[PDB]
Amino acid sequence: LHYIGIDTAKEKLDVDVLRPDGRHRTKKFANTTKGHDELVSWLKGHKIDHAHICIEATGTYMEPVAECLYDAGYIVSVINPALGKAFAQSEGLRNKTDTVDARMLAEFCRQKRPAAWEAPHPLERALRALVVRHQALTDMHTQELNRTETAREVQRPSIDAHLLWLEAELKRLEKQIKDLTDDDPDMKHRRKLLESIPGIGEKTSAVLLAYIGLKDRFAHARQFAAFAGLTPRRMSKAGHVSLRRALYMPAMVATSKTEWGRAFRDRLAANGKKGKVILGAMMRKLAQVAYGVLKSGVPFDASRH
Amino acid sequence: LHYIGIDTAKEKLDVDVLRPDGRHRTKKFANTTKGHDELVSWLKGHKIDHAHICIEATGTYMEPVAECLYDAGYIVSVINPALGKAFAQSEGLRNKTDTVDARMLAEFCRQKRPAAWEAPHPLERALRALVVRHQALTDMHTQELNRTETAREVQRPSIDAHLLWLEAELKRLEKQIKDLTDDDPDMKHRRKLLESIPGIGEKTSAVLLAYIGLKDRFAHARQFAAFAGLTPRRYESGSSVRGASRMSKAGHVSLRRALYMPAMVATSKTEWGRAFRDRLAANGKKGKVILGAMMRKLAQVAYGVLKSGVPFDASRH
Amino acid sequence: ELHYIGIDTAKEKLDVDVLRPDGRHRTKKFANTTKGHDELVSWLKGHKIDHAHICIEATGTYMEPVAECLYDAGYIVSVINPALGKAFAQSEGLRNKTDTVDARMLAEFCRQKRPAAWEAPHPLERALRALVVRHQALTDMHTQELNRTETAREVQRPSIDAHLLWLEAELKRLEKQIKDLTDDDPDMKHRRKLLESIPGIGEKTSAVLLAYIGLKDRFAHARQFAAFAGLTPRRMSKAGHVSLRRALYMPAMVATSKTEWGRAFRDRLAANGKKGKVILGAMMRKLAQVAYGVLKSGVPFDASRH
Amino acid sequence: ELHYIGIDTAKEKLDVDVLRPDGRHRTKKFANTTKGHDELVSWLKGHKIDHAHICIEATGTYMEPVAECLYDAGYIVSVINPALGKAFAQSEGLRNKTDTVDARMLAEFCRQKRPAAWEAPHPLERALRALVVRHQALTDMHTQELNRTETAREVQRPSIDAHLLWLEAELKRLEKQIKDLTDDDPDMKHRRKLLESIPGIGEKTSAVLLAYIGLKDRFAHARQFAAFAGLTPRRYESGSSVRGASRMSKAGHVSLRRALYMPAMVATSKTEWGRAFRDRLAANGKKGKVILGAMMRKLAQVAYGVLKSGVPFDASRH
RNA sequence: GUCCGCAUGCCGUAUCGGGCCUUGGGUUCUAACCUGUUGCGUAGAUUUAUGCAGCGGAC
RNA sequence: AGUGAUAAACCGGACAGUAUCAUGGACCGGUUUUCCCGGUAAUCCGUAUUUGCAAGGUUGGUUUCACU
DNA sequence: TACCACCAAGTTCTACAGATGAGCT
DNA sequence: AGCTCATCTGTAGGCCTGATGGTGGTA
DNA sequence: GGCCATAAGACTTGTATTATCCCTC
DNA sequence: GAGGGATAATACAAGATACTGTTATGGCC
Ligand SMILES: [Mg+2]
Ligand SMILES: [Mg+2]
């Protein structure tokens, strides 16, 4: 079993093979379909058939090669780059370069033996991509709303025209998201379950489903709450900002306008917890209950809370 | 002569009068047209005819009251908010940081006797509004451009639709700016003079007019370069203390923002600019250091050319 | 007819800037020497300047000779805390820092702010303060060597031991010199005795307090003297003499631990859930105020008041 | 067969964590005393732990006795730079309960990394380092009193003048004790003479260099010794877009880095080989302090080089 | 009701540090070349939030 | 101490943003320093968006209940 | 009258200065 | 033997840890 | 069945801008 | 003569003040 580190750039890949005997092989390739084919050929040239490959999440530039190698039948791991940075310090490395990084990742692979990565399902990719786009538009819409607050009259026609366009485009995406989940029987069913939770509506169900996926890739609900960056350490914030930010207003609605939410808010209020601290707790609770309800396969039952 | 400080917020004004005899008169008002009329009456009530008011430049919320008082005939100074903060720290060693009161502003006014403020011409206000709008849409356009690189396929129709919209809008504002400056014969002439400078074109000339204005409100070109935050900040004391010089950046960000690309065009594609680049390069200056020097130079020549009243003459450089 | 004069100060040179009533400036550079200071007084009288208010930053001890020269010549002198000058420059919108700029800045500071006049301290106060801060220096070095004995190698031990003996003898010598100083003055002797009547304050703290409180009633309120030490909150400000603040912590511990009035104070704050060091912080402020209070009263400490 | 043991040390107590081949742990606390150390070894031999690799953090003199005990008991001991410990913990997860490093973490560090084995220094190497370190302390104190002379009040000056004399005599005394140490050992006498043959290295810098290099050559390459001093440039590069400036890493002993600054200033100013090096670098647009940095690295590297060569400084090689 | 008095309550995390650890990257390949800004020392200045409470005195 | 179970309890301060303000050090001719008067589109002192904008990654600590 | 231990525990600013080794007087 | 003089914006990381002064208590 | 008010108060890689010149149709 | 592409720069830190929106639900007509 070989261990292979790949350092990724926009244009090139730097590869470092760590042989069982402990010697290294190194080569650069273009970060292209042609380059990826050269890489697989080169590995099978040196009779490397069984290998565990470690690569860092580097924008989207690592994705095609990771899929390529997975299909070629290698174990691929895509690591959070924070882990790689800490690892480099733990090895007492005194430089940061492409070849240094590729070698660091081969050692990471051997010592840590990280979990294997799976390529997401085409629909999972699509839904995530629509949810991320929708959030980008929403942010732009908010920028333009803030501007109306202090805008001069000559500026105001421009801002208004833009707000109309952005409102129409947001509505179009929402329908494109709905069509996606309605067409897949699994997603249609899983979305209907998420919405049964009081405090979770159309917008938040699509976000939750985008990050949970089609399958139950988490063993326990609390792992998904950790995934979102919501568990205390202060909150870790070791997780997707986009998932975490999407739960804040659902938390307020829950703690304010639902039976199970108010019950939770009061119990923590009694123990002398401040406004946001409760919302923090409710965010973590919504994440956990959302995953729980999907495992159960059954509508939200308030009796459990 | 009285000394009045006004502490401004969205909804409420807080006023503090400082009498010649050294006593204070304080009152709060609404930040509305009604509130501003109450204020003038309340001053005129206490026979305060001559005064020097000092207001922080907090944003658009303090502009209506400043214009109200300027019209009522008082002397109004609108001060950079960072001066107020620094003034407080000069008044004691343990003063409440992050607090500048109306009382503190009345003192500021008395001690410093700041320069008077003049409400801008309606045409200057218009042009500045359009230019600032133009810059905002450019930034959104660059946001969406950056996204096309790494976008997923489902996302691309959306990003493409938005880019076409933003281009059409940018083209429209450009025309609106052009129609503004062409319908005023002074601005039409002044803009033509700016664009005669090699490295200054349609977009930079508008930004420059927006901040120079119709009148010549700077006595010297070196003051306009200071205004943009482009001058080097020297730091020396005695024999021991010798800080390195750097662009001060104490000045208007929108001006400074607009001059970097012109500077890069001037030092690259132009005689008088390459002349300047080569000299400083010989004397050991790095590439982006030279750019910062060209930024200050363009500012200063822009003001020089307008004051001269004739097109850019290369012989002077 | 009052002129306003700024002086920027360096080790070797002085930059002087004179702001006239009519509003025009006169400037000149001088050597920072006895001869230079004489040239300065001549240059002013040359320009027919008798009434001036002079403003100079506290710049180590380099500003002190010229401050004394000008005060003796009969001018008004203000020695300003330079943190105020830096804020002033920023309030004045200045974009460069040079010696000629700073001298001009200080002349305006003078005109606008009209700071309180500076009085040169009494020779006895100057000496006492000098001995106290020396004593503190050597105590710092003694603690360093003493900390080293813990982890020291055996070849290092003879050296560290020999130094500890030297520093102990020197500290004793200085303490005696301080005692001889305060004894030879009737007022200081009396005031020293009053301060030591406070439970928690002994030979060492009393000399530090005398060295900053003055010979006379210098402060108008107790909390002013507590602010002077950097003890009033704004978190504790720490904007004040570190040598005075340093001196009050161990008194504060012994008082809150082993005195009636101090334990009383400790318990009151402990009732309201205050941490160990937070109580000590509070006790430091209190001691500073009571030290000032007792001296003003002119009579020994009375616990009944607290 | 091989066990992996972490030891979390404090002044008073040890906290031990054995990690067995099967993957289960043993834990027991001991007193940090001669008794405790003897008790620890017996407890290990009780559980028939004869082959092990112990891993301890380098926290000072409080952990040295136990490390020596175990080394003599026949185990493999590693004394790790504690910064490695903290970084390893962060590499093990994204949301760890605490940032602290404990005995269990050290056992896992040891298993995954199999760090290099620690060796107790020679008694003379230990003595020489101790004397050199003491000398540096006395210099700093002397420098403090020199600075005070400048702005002292008159009533203070007797005190400062008397201290300055005491410290000057003590520094002179300690220099002789260092000279006697190196002269008495034929190996150290020789090595020290070699170092002083280098232009720009004299009596003070030679003793500091010996103190860290020691009696034997424990670096495979001279460049590793410059790294040890923290004198090597730190490259920061990634892809097309990420390019930092190379700056002295400073990841090594301050004492060496401190010691070499003036030798570098002397070498580049007065010696031939140093001026040669200054000139070429200065021909490129290298600033004055940048060249000093470079010369500090070179001096470190040639110091190690010359000792490895075993023959005086040959100028023909430069 | 106002003005004064205060060794008053509310508010408060001192000072100086000390010791030990550190086995680059690239190259024309290890005392060569490209890549390099050490260490962190000294002195001086610092006058209330009387802000709000108490308690006391005078008018 | 491992192993499972967990939509329960304890620990929990999300994100994104918006608008606005800024009158050098000095140099060159007079005076014979500066100031002041006159001049500054020149020379020396400059690392833009007070370092802008985009994308990607993130599988709790414990408490209970079992089982050994 | 002299000696002991134990209480508490993880800001600004304005100016200055040494070091070491090789060559020169 | 003693003196001179060579560089100027600022920016590694970690883990162990303690005295001080004054008082009441003790010898 | 449609509309409105209300609840809280750091890692790994990338990138454009404008104005002038130069080129093709 | 009009329209479009390529291009110049690279370690980062170093002023302030005033402010706003997100979603999902239980209320309303
Ligand atoms: Mg990488
Ligand atoms: Mg000064």
Residue numbers in the entry:
A (entry chain C): 5 to 237, 250 to 321
B (entry chain D): 5 to 321
C (entry chain A): 4 to 237, 250 to 321
D (entry chain B): 4 to 321
Question: What wording appears in the published article?
Answer:
The IS621 recombinase consists of a RuvC domain (residues 1–122), a two-stranded α-helical coiled-coil domain (residues 123–188) and a Tnp domain (residues 189–326).
Using these mismatch-containing dDNA and tDNA molecules, we determined the cryo-EM structure of the IS621–bRNA–dDNA–tDNA synaptic complex at 2.5 Å resolution. The synaptic complex consists of four IS621 recombinase protomers (IS621.1–4) and the TBL and DBL modules of the bRNA, as well as tDNA and dDNA. IS621.1 and IS621.2 form a dimer that interacts with the TBL and tDNA, while IS621.3 and IS621.4 form a dimer that interacts with the DBL and dDNA. The tDNA and dDNA molecules bend around the central catalytic site, adopting an X-shaped architecture.
